[PDB]
Scaffold this motif. Structure first.
Motif, PDB file in Angstrom:
ATOM      1  N   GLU A  24      41.536  28.921  44.322  1.00 21.34           N
ATOM      2  CA  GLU A  24      42.103  29.953  43.762  1.00 21.34           C
ATOM      3  C   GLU A  24      43.331  30.325  44.562  1.00 21.34           C
ATOM      4  N   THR A  26      46.403  32.140  46.773  1.00 24.74           N
ATOM      5  CA  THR A  26      46.380  33.256  47.722  1.00 24.74           C
ATOM      6  C   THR A  26      46.814  34.595  46.763  1.00 24.74           C
ATOM      7  N   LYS A  29      43.882  35.715  44.761  1.00 25.50           N
ATOM      8  CA  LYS A  29      43.002  36.430  45.643  1.00 25.50           C
ATOM      9  C   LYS A  29      43.185  37.640  46.250  1.00 25.50           C
ATOM     10  N   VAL A  30      44.433  37.616  46.763  1.00 27.56           N
ATOM     11  CA  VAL A  30      44.892  38.839  47.528  1.00 27.56           C
ATOM     12  C   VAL A  30      45.189  39.853  46.606  1.00 27.56           C
TER      13      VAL A  30
END
Ligand SMILES: CCCCCCCCCCCCCCCCCC(=O)OC[C@H](COP(=O)(O)OCCN)OC(=O)CCCCCCCCCCCCCCCCC
Lengths: 74, 78
Positions: A24, A26, A29-30
């Motif tokens: 995934e 960043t 995800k973030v």
């Protein structure tokens, strides 16, 4: 536990994936973490329920359905 | 598993972003302040953006000797 005989094919789980193996991005995800993304979807699903007909009947003016086999007083 | 910063700083910054985002991005946002203080002012004055003069918060007393004014004297009252 598992059935006797040959063990189920691929019953053993694959080895665990590391933090840097999760594929995934960043930014995704973030973004999902900080934007509360999955819970905005749940908020939206309630919104379209808000614009759906209700299920409610107005007892006693309206009655729910009973069959010929219904068992009431003797 | 978890990287160590001093062994591999870049692999640590990737791990810190993905796994501990609230803590890691606190340090980025907070560090962005002193980066702002060091870069925006020079470029602003570069492009002619001029800091404004301070607004008066006390009567501005003029410097120098008094101007020896003639006019509006007591005789002019009537
Ligand atoms: C405007 C439009 C939206 C209007 C409606 C707003 C939503 C209202 C929803 C109801 C109130 C909010 C309910 C909050 C529920 C989230 C929560 O509290 O869960 C706690 C959770 C636990 O986090 P933790 O265990 O530490 O980390 C791993 C988590 N799997 O912690 C979390 O999951 C993290 C939650 C993040 C919330 C932080 C605020 C986000 C705003 C951006 C912060 C800016 C700083 C970051 C900069 C970006 C960096 C890329």
């Amino acid at each position: 536990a598992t059935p006797a005989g040959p063990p189920p094919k691929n019953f053993r789980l694959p080895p665990p994936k590391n933090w840097d193996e999760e594929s995934e991005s960043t930014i995704d995800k973030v973004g999902k973490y900080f934007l509360m993304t999955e819970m905005l979807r749940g908020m939206y699903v309630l919104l379209e329920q808000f614009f759906r007909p209700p299920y409610t009947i107005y007892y006693p003016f309206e009655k729910g359905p009973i069959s010929p086999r219904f068992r009431g007083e003797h | 598993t978890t990287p160590r910063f001093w062994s591999t700083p870049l692999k640590y910054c990737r791990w810190a972003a993905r796994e501990r985002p609230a803590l890691f991005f606190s340090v980025v946002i907070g560090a962005l302040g002193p980066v702002t203080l060091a870069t925006v002012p020079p470029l602003r004055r570069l492009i002619g953006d001029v800091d404004a003069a301070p607004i008066p918060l006390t009567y501005p007393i003029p410097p120098g000797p008094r101007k020896q004014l003639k006019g509006y004297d007591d005789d002019t009252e009537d």
